[PDB]
Amino acid sequence: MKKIEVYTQPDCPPCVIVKEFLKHNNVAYEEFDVKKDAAARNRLLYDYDSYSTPTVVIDGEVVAGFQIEKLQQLLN
């Protein structure tokens, strides 16, 4: 796992919101598009046990869905 992973897909405004929040905060993330990257899709569903995007993984912690304040907490 990378230290900060962000799972997204197209036509997903909540994903854009999370990403842009992360960017505004100058967070060093890596992003994965689960429609275009099958491995990333498999990690989301079968490693992280998350059914939707956005999902962010922060040093192993899975934050599934739209949870801004939990992200702020976890990031520093």
From TrEMBL:
<dbReference type="InterPro" id="IPR036249">
    <property type="entry name" value="Thioredoxin-like_sf"/>
</dbReference>
<dbReference type="InterPro" id="IPR002109">
    <property type="entry name" value="Glutaredoxin"/>
</dbReference>
<dbReference type="GO" id="GO:0009055">
    <property type="term" value="F:electron transfer activity"/>
</dbReference>
<dbReference type="InterPro" id="IPR011911">
    <property type="entry name" value="GlrX_YruB"/>
</dbReference>
<dbReference type="Pfam" id="PF00462">
    <property type="entry name" value="Glutaredoxin"/>
</dbReference>
<protein>
    <submittedName>
        <fullName>NRDH-redoxin</fullName>
    </submittedName>
</protein>
<feature type="disulfide bond">
    <location>
        <begin position="12"/>
        <end position="15"/>
    </location>
</feature>
<dbReference type="GO" id="GO:0045454">
    <property type="term" value="P:cell redox homeostasis"/>
</dbReference>
<dbReference type="InterPro" id="IPR051548">
    <property type="entry name" value="Grx-like_ET"/>
</dbReference>
<feature type="domain" description="Glutaredoxin">
    <location>
        <begin position="4"/>
        <end position="63"/>
    </location>
</feature>
